[PDB]
Amino acid sequence: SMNIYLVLDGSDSIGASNFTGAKKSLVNLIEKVASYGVKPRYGLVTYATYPKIWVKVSEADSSNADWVTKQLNEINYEDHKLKSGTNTKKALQAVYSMMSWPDDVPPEGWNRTRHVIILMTDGLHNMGGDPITVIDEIRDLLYIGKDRKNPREDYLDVYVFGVGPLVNQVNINALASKKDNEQHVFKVKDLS
Numbered sequence: 001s002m003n004i005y006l007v008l009d010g011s012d013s014i015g016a017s018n019f020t021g022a023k024k025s026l027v028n029l030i031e032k033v034a035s036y037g038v039k040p041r042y043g044l045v046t047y048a049t050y051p052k053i054w055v056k057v058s059e060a061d062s063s064n065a066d067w068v069t070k071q072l073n074e075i076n077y078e079d080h081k082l083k084s085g086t087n088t089k090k091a092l093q094a095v096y097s098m099m100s101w102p103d104d105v106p107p108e109g110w111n112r113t114r115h116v117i118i119l120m121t122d123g124l125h126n127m128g129g130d131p132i133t134v135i136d137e138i139r140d141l142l143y144i145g146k147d148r149k150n151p152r153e154d155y156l157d158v159y160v161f162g163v164g165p166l167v168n169q170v171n172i173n174a175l176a177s178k179k180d181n182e183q184h185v186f187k188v189k190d191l192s
């Protein structure tokens with residue numbers, strides 16, 4: 001069981017060209033995943049001053065790669081309001097909300113689901129504060145890094161793809177998972 005959360009920064013800093021490139025990379029990612037005969041539930045979020053959720057993992061067709069690829073392609077760089085701000089913390093809270101439990105208790109089989117966040121940004125957040133705190137809140141909800149004998153690090157992966165020529169590499173690096181002999185930081189020019 002796997003959930004893949006696609007989060008695409010749609011703020012002005014990104015630029016139409018690079019945003020179009022990012023979308024194309026997410027389309028190829030979805031096809032590369034499906035080429036393995038696996039069916040994750042997808043979440044799709046774009047953001048600037050505020051986030052917009054296009055697809056929730058709980059939706060019926062969230063595991064239909066064709067349908068997901070279709071909702072993605074229909075997103076336009078202009079389709080976002082206040083692009084003059086970048087609140088990455090709010091975008092990750094959108095992912096957190098998507099992980100929320102329906103009945104106050106962990107859902108059946110919750111400990112078996114792998115969560116993979118794919119964040120495309122230049123790391124230039126400028127509103128909302130440090131987004132790392134939300135990653136910590138997600139790890140708490142998923143009971144990752146809590147039990148010293150069952151850390152469950154395999155159940156969360158945060159990949160970050162740097163977009164554009166102007167990126168804050170320190171911030172991008174701070175958000176990506178850091179796992180021995182594994183790489184989680186990439187550029188659009190470069191899975192799940």
Ligand SMILES: [Mn+2]
Binds near residue numbers: 011014086124125
């Ligand atoms: Mn920005």
